[PDB]
Amino acid sequence: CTIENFKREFFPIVYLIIFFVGVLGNGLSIYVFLQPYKKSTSVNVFMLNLAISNLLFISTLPFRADYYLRGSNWIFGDLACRIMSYSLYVNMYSSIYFLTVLSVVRYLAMVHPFRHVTSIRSAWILCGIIWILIMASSIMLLDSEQNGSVTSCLELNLYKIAKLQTMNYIALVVGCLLPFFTLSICYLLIIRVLLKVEADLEDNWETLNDNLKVIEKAAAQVKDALTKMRAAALDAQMKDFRHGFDILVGQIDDALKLVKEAQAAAEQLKTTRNAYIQKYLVSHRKALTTIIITLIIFFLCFLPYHTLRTVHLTTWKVGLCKDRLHKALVITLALAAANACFNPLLYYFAGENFKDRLKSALR
Ligand SMILES: Cc1ccc(F)cc1CCCCOc1ccc(C(=O)Nc2cccc3c2O[C@H](C(=O)O)CN3CCCC(=O)O)cc1
Ligand SMILES: CC(C)CCC[C@@H](C)[C@H]1CC[C@H]2[C@@H]3CC=C4C[C@@H](O)CC[C@]4(C)[C@H]3CC[C@]12C
Ligand SMILES: CCCCCCCC/C=C\CCCCCCCC(=O)O
């Protein structure tokens, strides 16, 4: 079949591109992660696990490239071929779950921007669960260099066809479609919460500026406005935040009841309210960026690959090439592999003190 001629040129190129790009990206990302910083978070745990998985997988790519560069002749021994298969699939599904967990965590965080020792350890416990389950689910590959007159690895063949037809069925459903479903619900929930919270924040800021413009324009009415604002704040009852705001109000109302000092003190509420707003806004930015990048990764790297893989398995026959479908599969397999060098975009644009650690390293 002519696809083999296509493969022997196509795979070395993309595998080595992914190798070098991924070594640079992941090596630098892991170096940054491990830099000391005053605070740490569970999302750093999940990102670190993802980057380690990707770099381990990337370390296998020069061997696959060698395979194809030798005319599809494997020289590295039977165990190494087994490990090629195992590393490919363990990386793929560990990555999918680490991404899904990361999106879920960002949602749960944006719900509660203000309010633990335990969640750092919990992130490791969860990661360990994911590793155990995926590694145990994949050990089939370790139990199954086959060919004669040449040594062939990485190839679909009759011996394994039925096996993979069954295995696909589970990995398609639990390893791909269920996580993408979880992501789609997460997207819906992120958008809903973000829109509602920012509408509320705009209302809050607008009423504050109205009251402050009233105080700026017109001492008899200053006390009235301050008492109305104090009553509104008490009915709003972040105990320390409310107490700080109320203490601002009480200081202004004292400086009034004692016109220059009180009107000036009125402005101090504005900067504290802007910081209160910014905390929420940062949490929402992070969640939305994460979910968008992750959905794009899924559309590019994983769903086309699983679709074409499934159809390739279902229609496979011993003496037929199907070069066009097979070529499409080869390309989407490349994309799935390339996820391992794509993921540091997420570390850079949605990291947790990532740029802070990076600036520290630069110092
Ligand atoms: C079970 C489970 C559920 C949820 C999870 F999160 C995790 C798991 C554990 C997953 C364990 C692994 O599961 C699998 C593994 C493989 C599969 C599967 O279809 N394989 C498959 C399908 C079609 C072609 C090939 C194929 O693989 C061949 C090869 O590797 O040798 C090479 N080629 C040839 C590629 C083209 C070329 O180069 O000519 C399908 C499933
Ligand atoms: C992963 C892809 C397919 C997601 C696209 C799904 C579409 C249909 C989603 C994305 C954003 C979602 C919307 C987000 C916010 C709201 C406001 C809520 O009060 C009613 C539902 C509504 C209007 C959702 C409807 C469904 C929705 C429009
Ligand atoms: C990804 C390519 C193939 C790799 C096979 C599996 C390799 C596992 C390597 C690193 C996983 C690190 C495990 C740390 C999580 C355990 C944490 C804990 O138990 O508290």
Ligand SMILES: CCCCCCCC/C=C\CCCCCCCC(=O)O
């Ligand atoms: C992969 C994404 C699929 C596309 C889904 C399309 C639905 C988009 C709908 C709403 C997105 C709203 C973006 C946020 C606007 C914020 C403006 C504001 O809050 O003031």
